[PDB]
């Protein structure tokens, strides 16, 4: 019995499996071939994220089925703030946070009063009271901090 895995490079690997092989077992096989650890794997079949403890047969995964591998990451929503002198601050934020909130977080880390902070995103200077969501600031976006002293 063989199934196919569409890997993270774009390629497709073949795995020799058995109907009762768990998803956990499949993740091990992938880690052997692609060298990515099971904790990092999310396996998608026919629109369904697959569960570690269940078997191929529980999911009716038949010969020649194609599993899609997706990278799995873990961490609170973060953004970066670059300084005049190239230090990068990492911040834990939420989509609803206002720029006011973000300035309070900068004061927390670096001790700069909010009223001395100017924050820029995609060349655009941000206004407090508007949220990160309004500006389309996503996880791992980068803000630039400028100071009115
Ligand atoms: Cl086997
Ligand atoms: Zn066996
Ligand atoms: Zn917040
Ligand atoms: Zn302000
Ligand atoms: Zn990322």
Ligand 1 midpoint to CA 8 (Å): 23
| Integer Cα distance of 91 and 60 in angstroms | 43
Q: Are residues 111 and 69 in the same domain?
A: no
HEC states along the chain? Answer: CEEEEECCCCCEEEEECCCCCEHHHHHHHHHHHHCCCHHHEEEEECCEECCCCCECHHHCCCCCCEEEEEECCCCCCEEEEECCCCCEEEEECCCCCEHHHHHHHHHHHHCCCHHHEEEEECCEECCCCCECCCCCCCCCCEEEEEECC
Q: Phi, psi (5° rounding) for residue 92?
A: -85, 120
> Is the same domain home to 44 and 97?
no
Task: Give me the half-sphere count of Cα atoms (radius 13 Å) on the Cβ side of residue 28.
Answer: 9
Q: Which residue has the tokens 């191929």?
A: 56
Q: Are residues 63 and 82 in the same domain?
A: no
Count of domains observed in the chain: 2
Ligand 3 being an ion, which residues bring their Cβ within 5 A of it? 97, 101
| Experimental method, per PDB record | X-ray
Cα(123) to centroid(ligand 3), Å: 23
Q: Ligand 1 centroid vs 19 CA: distance in angstroms? A: 9
Residues in the chain: 149
Co-location of 10 and 36 in the same domain:
yes
Resolution in A: 2.2
Residues 46 and 93 in one domain: no
């Amino acid at each position: 019995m063989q199934i196919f895995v569409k890997t993270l490079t774009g390629k497709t690997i073949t795995l020799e499996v058995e109907p009762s092989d768990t998803i956990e077992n499949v993740k091990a096989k992938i880690q052997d071939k692609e060298g990515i650890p099971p904790d990092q794997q999310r396996l998608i079949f026919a629109g369904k994220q697959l569960e570690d403890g269940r078997t191929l047969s529980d999911y009716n995964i038949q010969k020649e089925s194609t599993l899609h591998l997706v990278l799995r990451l873990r961490g609170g929503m973060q953004i970066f703030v670059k300084t005049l002198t190239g230090k990068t601050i990492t911040l834990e934020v939420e989509p609803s946070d206002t720029i006011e909130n973000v300035k309070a977080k900068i004061q927390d880390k670096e001790g700069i009063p909010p009223d001395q902070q100017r924050l820029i995103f995609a060349g655009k200077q941000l206004e407090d009271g508007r949220t990160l969501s309004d500006y389309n600031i996503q996880k791992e976006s980068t803000l630039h901090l400028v100071l009115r002293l």
